Amino acid sequence: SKFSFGQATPRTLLGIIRLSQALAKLRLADMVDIDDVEEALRLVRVSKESLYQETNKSKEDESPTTKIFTIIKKMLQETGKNTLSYENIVKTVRLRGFTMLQLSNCIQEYSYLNV
Amino acid sequence: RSSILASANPIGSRYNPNLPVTENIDLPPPLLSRFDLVYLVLDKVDEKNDRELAKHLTNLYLEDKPEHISQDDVLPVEFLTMYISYAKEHIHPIITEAAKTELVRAYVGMRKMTTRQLES
């Protein structure tokens, strides 16, 4: 890419350890917690993200039909059949938290396009 | 009369796999043939290698003494120096007829794929 930085050298791994150990000295603690590792890794990501702009977009809250489609992919991974009789997928949707009325509308929608 | 143990480095600090060894390093061709062992330690990105290497370096900083390693597995520095100085003043290996026959056959097969490699 255009923002080709340096290679992941083993010296960069020891730098996070030295930054995490120095953060514990300011808090007067003899043990490094999880907060010291996340704070040391944040300073490295900031210096590396100085070239990119401040435009970040993220969206992942669509219809719940996509979550039900992930359960169908689990059955195709173990078997791989597109039959109409589905008696094991209904037992997995009930354990999640979805209703049985919305499940029948999702199976009929996918069966029309043969998925 | 002493051995030379150096470590070379590429020009752009990155050994490109699509470039010859003579073009990546600015060393003279006669200087490369004078050496005996030209090791090429690369920094390959591997998930199975970086995981085990980080655990080995972390164990050295946790405990000052390797308690997990037995005493019969790591020799001290005082005993290692006494094993080299003793063998370099009394042990003198002699090349026999069976050992000299395999050295000639190995030198011919390497050229079919300089005299400095024979003495190494």
Discontinuities in chain B (C→N > 2.5 Å), after residue:
113
Of A7, A8, A13, the CB nearest to B14: A7
Closest among A114, A35, A39, A41 to A81, alpha carbons compared? A114
Q: Cβ distance A111 to A84 under 8 Å? A: yes
Q: Rounded to whole angstroms, how far apart are CA atoms A19 and A12? A: 11
- Helical H segments across B68-96, by residue range: 77-90
DSSP annotation of B67: S
Residue type, B12: G
Q: Rounded to whole angstroms, how far apart are CA atoms B5 and A109? A: 71
Cβ contact B14–A9 (<8 Å): no
DSSP annotation of B35: -
What chain B residue is nearest to A17 in terms of C-alpha separation?
A: B58
Q: Rounded to whole angstroms, how far apart are CA atoms B44 and B21? A: 17
Q: State in Å, rounded, how far the first CA of chain B is from the last one.
A: 15
Q: Rounded to whole angstroms, how far apart are CA atoms B49 and B56? A: 11
CB pairs under 8 A between A and B: 9
Instruction: Name the method of structure determination.
Output: cryo-EM
Count other C-beta atoms under 10 Å from residue A95's C-beta: 7
Return the sign of the alpha-carbon dihedral for residues B73, B77, B78, B84: positive
Residue type, B69: I
Q: Rounded to whole angstroms, how far apart are CA atoms A54 and A67? A: 31
Residue to substitute from A12, A17, A30, interface B, most B β-carbons within 10 A: A17
Q: Cβ distance A93 to A103 under 8 Å? A: yes
Q: Rounded to whole angstroms, how far apart are CA atoms B62 and B56? A: 10
Count other C-beta atoms under 10 Å from residue A36's C-beta: 20
Collect all residues with Cβ–Cβ distance below 8 Å to B92 and sequence separation of at least 6.
none
Q: Rounded to whole angstroms, how far apart are CA atoms B57 and B51? A: 10
> Residue A17: its chain B contacts at CB < 8 A?
61
Return the sign of the alpha-carbon dihedral for residues B43, B47, B53, B54: positive
Reduced to 3 states, what is the DSSP secondary structure of residue A21? helix
Q: Rounded to whole angstroms, how far apart are CA atoms B81 and A68? A: 69
Tokens for B115, please give them: 């005299």
Query: Quick check: B43 contacting A, CB < 8 Å?
Result: yes
Backbone dihedral region for residue A80 (phi beyond 0: left; psi -120 to 50: alpha; all else: beta): left
Binding residues of A for ATP: 11
DSSP annotation of B107: H
CA–centroid distance for B24 within its chain: 20
> Residue A10: its chain B contacts at CB < 8 A?
43, 53
Residue to substitute from B43, B46, B55, interface A, most A β-carbons within 10 A: B43
Reduced to 3 states, what is the DSSP secondary structure of residue B61? helix
Binding residues of A: 11
Cβ contact A10–B43 (<8 Å): yes
Query: Quick check: B105 contacting A, CB < 8 Å?
Result: no
Q: Rounded to whole angstroms, how far apart are CA atoms B117 and B120? A: 5
- In the block, which residue shows the tokens 């195709």? A76
